[PDB]
């Protein structure tokens, strides 16, 4: 009755050894490298010795497919996920990969989206720890705190201040401006670039800050800090549901307590628990206003954002949009509405799906205010929904590792062979920039370059006055 149709080899248990591997130990592309745990020998049909079994068919070992999310790939094929790319080789993924990263976002007036995708609402008026590495055993490298003033129920005139301490340097982001109160010890990797509507601050190899100059604060950290950071942005462990862990290593069920646990200054009063008001003042007892808010926020799931609905979760962004628009008197001039839509579009474009949603009817933007072609500025200011944020300029001649692929706003296109200058806001010759060059790296005037930071015998600090380069030996503290 054990009729194995050829070329399938029949295996029958000796019934005496009681140790031979039978049919249970079927080899498969899934489990070729895995040890068999057999209770006892099973008799049955098997693929010939040179082949393994794949679903309902026998395939050669050289043609075993590699596996990925709900899919199979033939050997030699390539795939790309996140920051990494891999090739199918011996049922494995041989990867030529970079270092991935994740972004924690301050969405809306008082909404926080952690690195693990957890979104919560916390209308705290205190100054809180946005993200810090001081979590038990800590190296103590960076600490970013956020302070909100006016983000209560009358959140129309709210303001946010970002205080960043890194390598002994203090940076304050406020009123759409960046002030370096104390210079960092190593300024080689410290860069601040202004591209379009956004400002990108690189504060090291794995620390990036993105600001929309009004309300959107994004902290980009590489995966090396998967188990080193803590705060309002979570512990970066990859688990969404445990981001509500307080500073005392206790998970808080109420987000208000989790937010209050990371208070910096005890002078300010703690945020008390308030029942969730679904309809604020403008939307309270106003069906028409709520309908208008819902219709305005429905654009996040429209045809223009159709390609993004399969990549980025639209529920938290839609909730933030509704909550912010229900506090605005009018939708046309609602700054929070446009800022939330711009942040969502930026997130969508970070995955490769750029959406051109802006129009004169809804959140109009134009570059004609700065396109002073007749005023001696030889630059072409054009609006772009996603343009590179690390374009070479006089202030940034050396290419930089941009944390984001592209950003939205006005960019100054130049004639070929020219370089933009932000101080003069115009395109000039590449040699006209006040840029020095050392060790193959070009840096604008006023910048400090550190060579051999860990070698006292070769440590050098180089400065550029205008075009002359002056390098001095580093002073030994002792």
């Amino acid at each position: 009755s054990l009729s194995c149709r050829p070329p399938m080899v029949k295996l029958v248990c000796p019934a005496d050894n009681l140790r031979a591997e039978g049919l249970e130990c079927t080899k498969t592309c899934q489990n070729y490298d895995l040890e068999c745990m057999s209770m006892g020998c099973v008799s049955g049909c098997l693929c010939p010795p040179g082949m393994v079994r794949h679903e309902n068919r026998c395939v050669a070992l050289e043609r075993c497919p590699c596996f990925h999310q709900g899919k199979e790939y033939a050997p030699g094929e390539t795939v790309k996920i996140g920051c990494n790319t891999c090739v199918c080789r011996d049922r494995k993924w041989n990867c030529t990969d970079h270092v991935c990263d994740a972004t924690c976002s301050t969405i809306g007036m008082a909404h926080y989206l952690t690195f693990d995708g957890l979104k919560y609402l916390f209308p705290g008026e205190c100054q809180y720890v946005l993200v810090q590495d001081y979590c038990g055993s800590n190296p103590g490298t960076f600490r970013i705190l956020v302070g909100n003033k006016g983000c209560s129920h009358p959140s129309v005139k709210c303001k946010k201040r970002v205080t960043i301490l890194v390598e002994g340097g203090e940076i304050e982001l406020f009123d759409g401006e960046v002030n370096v109160k104390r210079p960092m010890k190593d300024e080689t990797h410290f860069e601040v670039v202004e591209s379009g509507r956004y400002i990108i601050l690189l504060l090291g190899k794995a620390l990036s800050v993105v600001w929309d100059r009004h309300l959107s604060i994004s902290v980009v950290l590489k995966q090396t800090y998967q188990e080193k950071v803590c705060g309002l942005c979570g512990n970066f462990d990859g688990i969404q549901n445990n981001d509500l862990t307080s500073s005392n290593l206790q998970v808080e069920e109420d987000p208000v307590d989790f937010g209050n646990s990371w208070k910096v200054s005890s002078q300010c009063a703690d945020t008390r628990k308030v029942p969730l008001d679904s309809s604020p003042a403008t939307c309270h007892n106003n069906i028409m206003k709520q309908t208008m808010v819902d219709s305005s926020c429905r654009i996040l799931t429209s045809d223009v954002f159709q390609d993004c609905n399969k990549l980025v979760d639209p529920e938290p962004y839609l909730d933030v949009c509704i909550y912010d628009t229900c506090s605005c008197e009018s939708i046309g001039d609602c700054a929070a509405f446009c800022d939330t839509i711009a942040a969502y579009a930026h997130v969508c474009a970070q995955h490769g799906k750029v959406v051109t949603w802006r129009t004169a009817t809804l959140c109009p933007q134009s570059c004609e205010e700065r396109n002073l072609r007749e005023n001696g500025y030889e630059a072409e200011w054009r609006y772009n929904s996603c343009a590179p944020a690390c374009q070479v300029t006089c202030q940034h001649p050396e290419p930089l590792a941009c944390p984001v692929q592209c950003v939205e706003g006005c960019h100054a296109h130049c004639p070929p062979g020219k370089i933009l200058d932000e101080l003069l806001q115009t395109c000039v010759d590449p040699e006209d920039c006040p840029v020095c060059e050392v060790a193959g790296r070009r840096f604008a005037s006023g910048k400090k370059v550190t060579l051999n930071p860990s070698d006292p015998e070769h440590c050098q600090i180089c400065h550029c006055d205008v075009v002359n380069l002056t390098c001095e030996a580093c002073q030994e503290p002792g």
Binding site: S1, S3, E24, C25, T28, N31, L34, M39, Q69, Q290
Partner: protein
């Protein structure tokens, strides 16, 4: 259409020509006060229920008796709420009201006649069935609760119902007593009004009723019966039989309808039928001559000593018989050359339709005799009746026999009908004296007679006593031992292999086999090693009722010395056997002239007939399939063949294939492997213990089904060392022979249909080869009742497993019966009908199984649930001849609660765990730092303990991830159980000893593995064979309940019409319209839930299905609208049948409060432990969060 019948079980006093009987009576109104008139010819029969193929029958049964009754119908289809029979079908108490109707109560049964229940193209205008009370089959049948059910073709709506019933007053409901053999409840020709038309043909819907195996032969004098366009001399009524007969009345006057069995002459199954207006000539000279006949010439002699050796009180072989002899001339001087084969038979008479037989008979014997044919009607003198006219010795008479049209075979019958002629002066005495001759009635020749000559009834007994015995004075005629030696069981007058027919190899032979004599039981005639073409189909065993003949066609392709006999043990051992001498005169898909090798052994095992489900254990011998020729590892029998029980392995083959069976006798006494299909080219088919034998042959067209019948045919194989004791010891098995390209090359079976082989027999442990050992082990006129088991495949009392089939698929049933004459089994599938194929297609619902015959039927189950296949013989069913089979639906495949939390944490266990990765976390989509079961050990297992047995259609497995590693189970096997003690590994469609499932390749992908055929279990168990790092599992069981009621009723799929949902009030404004018709589950949009205008605890949402449905669970869900999470947290449920009479769903005596949602997005399902049979459903919310909003989904099924 719809037909209303008002039935009442009225308890009356009945006289057959005064006992107390309960009878179904038809009334006129629903008040059951006025009884509808019934014609006098019906008697004890209830009213005739006639239904067309597209009708529905509604019967209101009121129990006016002192005992419970019911209405169990045969032939029609119905739901479990109208079956009328009580057994372990796992239905609700609302579906149990049909089972018993206690006195004073009432019930309503609805029977649907479908296209499946209609007569086929070949079946007559109306199929015949019966309804009957089924509370206690023996008492209900013997009390008179039986009625006719005529299923006619559409447009069908003269004909008579005939109930040939043996009412045993000792087993009725009023017994707390003779057996009355009656026609429609009347005995001794007292049945009136049975009129018929002069020339018009009359249809008889014959129902034979009886609680004990008791066959009947029904003759109408001067008439024949057309059954399935086959001409027959009589009706062969089995104890429970449905058939349709057609009789062409031609002669005016009164004729007798009677049972011809001699032992039933005093019983009185007689009635009168009043018919009223509404060229070749053979010449034969035959003489009756007295002569000495040697019943066993050239035989050297125990049975042989008792029957053949002469002694002081033993006559011996020779007896003075009287015999018919053929003479060449009128002067009666020279006899024609006699043949050794014909034996005691007279000259063979032949006649075609319209031919005339000119018979000239001279009574040359010393006693008056006569000659008269059976089957031939027009018998006249050449120049009361000639039947009783005696011919004085020395006289000469001339008869003229005219073979008319109503005597010859039809185009469906064989070319020649086998009849006889004999003396009708004293039928039994003249027949026992030796006057019998063969007759052939053919349409425009090896005769074999199985005859029991009772010499004690012969007219020449005194002369034999005075001649062959030394002391005639010292002869005790009443001595049973002396009388036994005179009852000669012979073939053509030859006893103990004194007859040897020799036929040529590769020739065609017509055998006319006849069964006349003192025997009152049917005979199971067989030719060892030969299949023969009877009624246009190749069969193996011929069932011969007394006084009947059958024509058989066969080709003598099997050479050797074979034994022709009958499967009656006493007759076989009393010398009713004859000898028959035959001699010459690259990647590929695993699934997408050959020899089919098998390895069967005879093994000794303990068997308790399924009574463990002190219990006696009997040591039996069975056929056992092994993997290979070493016979050291038996082949595992899985889900598909678990129904076999005691039956042996399926030996499947096609035409032109080679069967090679290696048979090893591992038992304690010699056995054999015998099948009638084993061909050779005598032989000692005798396998000693610890010896092997190979049976190799080629399957030919005579071993296969014809082009008309089903794709496979079933044959029986068994041990032939002792045909009776070896069957009682448990040696029997199915051999399937199928058409070409009908078996799957990879699996070896026909996967288009699903096949089940049922073997019904009464095992008698007193007749087994191990009776002494069984008595010694167990026992440390009711003694034999404790050792007889009316089993199906060796199982009694609904304990046979494995009969699980899918709805709307085609099922092929191979039905076998083996044993003595008591094994006439009236096999019935409750609520289901099937088709049989001889040369046409016939629709049936009952089948009478005769020992040695392996029938094949095919059905299509339409209703889901647990049904019963039983034997309608009251005593066999009461002794436990029944079993349960489940018809599941593939549609009902719903989560079993692993992810929904319905399976609590105490129902999940495991061999162990690693850290805090508890087995209770092994749930699909479970999220967390520790979100799965996981163990750091090899050879683990995770067990889910479902609270009740249920159907498992598949399992959805999922791994998990740790800090940087993915953990999953790549390969696993599945075990399951119903009590937690015996674990049976899953096999399904596998080619090996278990089904191997493949698991996950990552930590998030859901791997869905199917169970087909499904699992029917209470416990399930997963054993990981391969795992990545640790055996981590997040699983989800997909399944259903036994009655297949767990699927949604059409809210999430929007199958419910928008006009079918309403409410007391709904909240609407200029923008949002929370209409009730938008409360469907998982509905996405604006105002996607029902919300009343005013929030109050007296609101309700009403769903109307416009038809009776069964609700078994309600799934509720909330909404999140305008950042407000509104959802009902507690609610109650009410039901109504018309919309204005509502009742709250109370549980345990008080109203049940259903726990709603904890969050608006996760649905929660509350299952009603008692099913709710309703048309109108209402949900009343009690506690609501932030508003009264509810999205609902009803779980259930359809009903009547």
């Amino acid at each position: 259409a719809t037909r209303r019948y008002y039935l009442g079980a009225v308890e009356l006093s009945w006289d057959y020509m005064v006992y107390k009987k309960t009878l179904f009576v038809e009334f006129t109104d629903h008040l059951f006060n006025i009884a509808k008139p019934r014609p006098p010819w019906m008697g004890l029969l209830g009213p005739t229920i006639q239904a067309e193929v597209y009708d529905t029958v509604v019967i209101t049964l009121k129990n006016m008796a002192s005992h419970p009754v019911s209405l169990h119908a045969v032939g029609v289809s119905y739901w479990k709420a109208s079956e009328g029979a009580e057994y372990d079908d796992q239905t609700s108490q609302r579906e149990k009201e049909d089972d018993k109707v206690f006195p004073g109560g009432s019930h309503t049964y609805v029977w649907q006649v479908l296209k499946e229940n209609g007569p086929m193209a070949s079946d007559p205008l109306c199929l015949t069935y019966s309804y009957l009370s089924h509370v206690d089959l023996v008492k209900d049948l013997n009390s008179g609760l039986i009625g006719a059910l005529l299923v006619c073709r559409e447009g069908s709506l003269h004909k008579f119902i005939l109930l040939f019933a043996v009412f045993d007053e000792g087993k009725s409901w009023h017994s707390e007593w003779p057996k009355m053999h009656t026609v429609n409840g009347y005995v001794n020709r007292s049945l009136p009004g049975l009129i018929g038309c002069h020339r018009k043909s009359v249809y008889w819907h014959v129902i034979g009723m009886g609680t004990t195996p008791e066959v009947h032969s029904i003759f109408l004098e001067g008439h024949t019966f057309l059954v399935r366009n086959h001409r027959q001399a009589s009706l062969e009524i089995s104890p429970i039989t449905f058939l349709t007969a057609q009789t062409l009345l031609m002669d005016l006057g009164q004729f007798l309808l009677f049972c011809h069995i001699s032992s039933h002459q005093h019983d009185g199954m007689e009635a009168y039928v009043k018919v009223d207006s509404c060229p070749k000539t053979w010449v034969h000279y035959i003489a009756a001559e007295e002569e000495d006949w040697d019943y066993a010439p050239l035989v050297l002699a125990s049975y042989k000593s008792q029957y053949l050796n002469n002694g002081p009180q033993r006559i011996g072989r020779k007896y003075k018989k009287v015999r018919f002899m053929a003479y060449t001339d009128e002067t009666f001087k020279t006899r024609e050359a006699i043949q050794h084969e014909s034996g005691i038979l007279g000259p063979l008479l032949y006649g075609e339709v319209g031919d005339t037989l000119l018979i000239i008979f001279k009574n040359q014997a010393s006693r008056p005799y006569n000659i008269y044919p059976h089957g031939i009607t027009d018998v006249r003198p050449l120049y009361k009746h000639l039947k009783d006219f005696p011919i004085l010795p020395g006289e000469i008479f001339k008869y003229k026999w005219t073979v008319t049209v109503e005597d010859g075979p039809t185009k469906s019958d064989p070319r020649c009908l086998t009849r006889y002629y004999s003396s009708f002066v004293n039928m039994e005495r003249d027949l026992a004296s030796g006057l019998i001759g063969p007759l052939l009635i053919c349409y425009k020749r090896n005769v074999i007679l199985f005859s029991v000559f009772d010499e004690n009834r012969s007219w020449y007994l005194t002369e034999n006593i005075q001649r062959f015995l030394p002391n005639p004075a010292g002869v005790q005629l009443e001595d049973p031992e002396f009388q036994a030696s005179n009852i000669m069981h012979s073939i053509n007058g030859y006893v103990f292999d004194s007859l040897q027919l020799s036929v040529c190899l590769h020739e065609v032979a017509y055998w006319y086999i006849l069964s006349i004599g003192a025997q009152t039981d049917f005979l199971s005639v067989f030719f060892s090693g030969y299949t023969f073409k009877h009624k246009m189909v190749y069969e193996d065993t011929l069932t011969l009722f007394p006084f009947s003949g059958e024509t058989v066609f066969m080709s003598m392709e099997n050479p050797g010395l074979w034994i022709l006999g009958c499967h009656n043990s006493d007759f076989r051992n009393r010398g009713m056997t004859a000898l028959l001498k035959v001699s010459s005169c690259e990647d590929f898909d695993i699934y997408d002239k050959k020899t089919r090798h098998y390895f069967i052994a005879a093994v000794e095992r303990l068997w308790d007939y399924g009574m463990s489900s002190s219990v006696p254990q009997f040591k039996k011998v069975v056929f056992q399939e092994f993997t290979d020729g070493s016979f050291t590892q038996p082949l595992y029998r899985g889900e598909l063949n678990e129904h076999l029980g005691l039956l042996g392995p399926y030996i499947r083959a096609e035409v032109e294939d080679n069967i090679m069976v290696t048979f090893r006798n591992q038992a304690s006494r010699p056995y054999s492997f015998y099948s009638s299909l084993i061909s050779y080219e005598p032989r000692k088919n005798f396998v000693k213990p610890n010896e092997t034998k190979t049976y190799f042959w080629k399957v030919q067209h005579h071993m296969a089904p014809t082009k008309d019948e089903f794709d496979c045919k079933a044959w029986a194989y068994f041990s032939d060392v002792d045909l009776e004791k070896d069957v009682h010891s448990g040696l029997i098995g199915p051999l399937l022979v199928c058409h070409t390209n009908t078996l799957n090359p990879a699996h070896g079976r026909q996967v288009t249909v699903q096949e089940f082989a049922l073997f019904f027999t009464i095992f008698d442990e007193t007749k087994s080869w191990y009776f002494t050992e069984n008595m010694e082990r167990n026992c440390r006129p009711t003694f034999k009742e404790n050792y007889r088991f009316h089993a199906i495949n060796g199982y009694i009392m609904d304990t046979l497993p494995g009969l699980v089939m899918a709805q709307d698929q085609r099922i092929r049933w191979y039905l076998l019966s083996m044993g003595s004459n008591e094994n006439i089994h009236s096999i019935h599938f409750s609520g289901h009908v099937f088709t049989v194929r001889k040369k046409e297609e016939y629709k049936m619902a009952l089948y009478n199984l005769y020992p040695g015959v392996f029938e094949t039927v095919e059905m299509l189950p339409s209703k889901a649930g647990i049904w019963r296949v039983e034997c309608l013989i009251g005593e066999h069913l009461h002794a436990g001849m029944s079993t349960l089979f489940l018809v599941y639906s593939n549609k009902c495949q719903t989560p079993l609660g692993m992810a929904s939390g319905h399976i609590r944490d105490f129902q999940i266990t495991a061999s162990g765990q690693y850290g805090q990765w508890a087995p209770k976390l092994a749930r699909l989509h479970y999220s967390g730092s520790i979100n799965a079961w996981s163990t750091k050990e090899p050879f683990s297992w995770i067990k889910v303990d479902l609270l009740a047995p249920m159907i498992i259609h598949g399992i959805k497995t999922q791994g998990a991830r740790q800090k940087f590693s993915s953990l999953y189970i790549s390969q696993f096997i599945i075990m399951y159980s119903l009590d937690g003690k015996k674990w049976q590994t899953y096999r399904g469609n596998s080619t090996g000893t278990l089904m191997v499932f493949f698991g996950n390749v990552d930590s998030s992908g859901i791997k869905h593995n199917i169970f087909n055929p499904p699992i029917i279990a209470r416990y399930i168990r997963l054993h990981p064979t391969h795992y990545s790092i640790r055996s981590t599992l997040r699983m989800e069981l997909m399944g259903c309940d036994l009655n297949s009621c767990s699927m949604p009723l059409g809210m999430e799929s929007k199958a419910i019409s928008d006009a079918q949902i309403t409410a007391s009030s709904y909240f609407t404004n200029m923008f949002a319209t929370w209409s009730p018709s938008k409360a469907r589950l998982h509905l996405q949009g604006r105002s996607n839930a029902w919300r009343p205008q005013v929030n109050n605890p007296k609101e309700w949402l009403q769903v109307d299905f416009q038809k009776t449905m069964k609700v078994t669970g309600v799934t509720t869900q909330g909404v999140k609208s305008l950042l407000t999470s509104m959802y009902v947290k507690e609610f109650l449920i009410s039901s109504s049948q018309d919309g204005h009479q509502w009742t709250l769903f109370f549980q345990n005596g008080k109203v049940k409060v259903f726990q709603g949602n904890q969050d608006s997005f996760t649905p929660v399902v509350n299952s009603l432990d008692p099913p709710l049979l309703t048309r109108y459903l209402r949900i009343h919310p009690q506690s609501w969060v932030h508003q009264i909003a509810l999205r609902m989904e009803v779980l259930g099924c359809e009903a009547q």
